[PDB]
Design a protein around this ligand. Structure first.
Ligand SMILES: Nc1ncnc2c1ncn2[C@@H]1O[C@H](COP(=O)(O)OP(=O)(O)O)[C@@H](O)[C@H]1O
Ligand SMILES: [Mg+2]
Ligand SMILES: [Mg+2]
Length: 359
C-alpha cells in the first residue's frame, strides 16, 4: 500500500535501476482482483533516456492473503516459475517478502469487441494450440498433480460454498446446484473416456478470458496463470467460448454485461477449432475431418456445462470475501452463471448428449 516502499524495493531489485532514486520512479496501481495488488512501476521517461534505462516498466505483484486467497495455494508460484522459464508467462524478474516483480508487457489486453475480429480469433487459436502442446513437447515437473482441474476447482470451491450460512440466493436453492455439481463430475468421468481429441489432458490456462490475453502487437501473450494446471483441453476452449458473451469493462453497476446473442458464431467456432488443431496436432493436421470438428464442438459444450457451476461457486466465495466492501456484484454474476448452467443443461438434454445425467 505504501508507494515509497514499492519504489525502494524496485530500485533495489530491478537491475541498473540503482542509478535512479525514489523521485525518478512512478507507481501506478492497476485494476485487478483483490488477491492481487498489482502496480505499474516505471522510471520517468526523461530520466530513463539520459540514464539510458532500457527496462522502463515492471509488473509489481503483491501477494494477497494466504487463505483469504482461498483459490490456489503456494503451488501458484511453482507453476508460474515453470511457465516463466519456458517463455510462456511474463518473465519473472525478482522476488521480495510478500510478492514478486514480473516483466512488463507493453500493449493492452483484448477487448470484448476484439473477440468479434476473425483474425484475432485465429490468432488466439494459434497461440492456444501451440500452448497446449507443452505437456508433450517439454518436460513438466513430475510431482505435479495430473488430476484434471475441472475436478479440483469444482471440488475445492463446492466445499467452500457448502459451509455458508443461509445463502438466500435468488431462486433459493444453492444446494440444488451443489447436487448438480456432483452429477456433472460423475457424468464427466464417464464422458471424457470416449476417444476424443478434446478429451486430451494437457496443461491448461483454466482462466481464458479477454482480459488475460495481452495484445502486444508483437504477438498475443497469456497472463494470470494462478489457476493453470492439468485439464481437458476442451475446458480451456469452452471457457474462451463462454467469455465471448461476458463484458467486464462496463463501469456502472453491476460492472458486467451478459449478451448471450454475442456467443461465438458456429462458423467462427469451426474456424477456431480448425485453426487450433492446425497447431495442436502440429504434424498431420489433416484431422480437420468435419466429423472430428462436430465432435470437438460437442465436448466443448459439455465442459461449458460444468464451467458455469465452477465459476458460480468461485463468485459466491468472492462475494463473501468482499462481503461489505463491494463494487462488482459477485452474487448477481453467480446467478447469471447458474442461469447459464440451467440453459446449457436444457440445451444439452434437448440434443440427448448428457445421457444418464439423472437430470
Ligand atoms: N506483465 C504484465 N504487463 C502488463 N500488464 C499486466 C501484466 N500482468 C498483469 N497486467 C495487467 O493487470 C491486469 C490483471 O492482472 P491479472 O494477472 O490478470 O490479475 P487478476 O486477473 O488475478 O486480477 C490485466 O488486465 C493486465 O492489463
Ligand atoms: Mg486476469
Ligand atoms: Mg487472476
Amino acid at each position: 500500500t505504501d508507494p515509497l516502499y514499492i519504489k525502494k524495493i524496485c530500485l533495489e531489485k530491478v537491475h541498473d535501476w540503482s542509478r535512479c532514486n525514489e523521485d525518478d520512479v512512478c507507481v501506478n496501481q492497476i485494476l485487478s482482483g483483490l488477491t492481487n495488488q498489482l502496480f505499474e512501476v516505471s522510471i520517468k521517461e526523461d530520466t530513463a533516456i539520459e540514464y539510458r534505462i532500457t527496462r522502463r516498466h515492471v509488473l509489481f505483484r503483491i501477494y494477497g492473503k494466504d487463505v483469504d486467497a482461498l483459490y490456489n495455494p503456494l503451488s501458484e508460484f511453482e507453476v508460474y516459475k515453470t511457465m516463466s522459464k519456458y517463455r510462456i508467462a511474463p518473465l519473472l524478474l525478482n522476488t521480495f517478502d510478500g510478492g514478486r516483480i514480473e516483466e512488463w508487457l507493453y500493449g493492452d489486453p483484448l477487448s470484448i469487441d476484439d473477440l468479434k475480429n476473425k483474425s484475432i480469433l485465429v490468432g488466439i487459436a494459434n497461440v492456444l494450440g501451440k500452448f497446449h502442446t507443452l505437456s508433450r513437447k517439454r518436460h513438466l515437473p513430475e510431482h505435479w498433480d495430473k488430476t484434471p482441474c475441472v475436478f479440483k476447482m469444482m471440488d475445492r470451491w463446492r466445499l467452500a460454498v457448502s459451509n455458508y450460512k443461509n445463502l438466500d440466493k435468488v431462486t433459493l436453492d444453492i444446494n440444488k446446484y451443489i447436487q448438480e455439481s456432483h452429477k456433472f463430475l460423475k457424468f464427466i468421468k464417464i464422458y471424457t473416456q470416449i476417444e476424443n481429441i478434446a478429451n486430451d489432458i494437457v496443461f491448461c490456462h483454466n482462466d481464458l478470458q479477454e482480459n488475460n490475453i495481452m495484445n502486444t502487437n508483437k504477438c498475443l501473450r497469456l497472463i494470470d496463470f494462478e489457476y493453470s494446471g492439468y485439464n481437458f483441453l476442451s475446458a480451456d476452449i469452452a471457457n474462451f467460448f463462454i467469455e465471448t458473451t461476458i463484458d467486464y469493462s462496463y463501469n456502472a453497476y453491476p460492472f458486467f454485461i451478459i449478451n448471450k446473442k454475442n456467443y461465438i458464431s458456429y462458423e467462427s467456432r469451426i474456424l477456431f477449432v480448425t485453426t487450433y488443431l492446425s497447431k495442436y496436432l502440429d504434424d498431420s493436421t489433416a484431422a480437420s475431418d468435419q466429423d472430428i470438428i462436430d465432435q470437438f464442438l460437442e465436448a466443448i459444450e459439455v465442459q461449458a456445462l460444468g464451467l458455469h457451476l465452477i465459476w458460480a461457486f468461485w463468485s459466491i466465495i468472492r462475494g463473501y470475501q468482499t462481503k461489505s466492501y463491494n463494487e462488482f456484484d459477485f452474487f448477481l454474476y453467480a446467478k447469471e452463471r447458474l442461469k447459464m448452467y440451467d440453459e446449457q443443461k436444457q440445451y444439452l438434454m434437448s440434443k440427448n448428449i448428457i445421457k444418464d445425467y439423472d437430470d
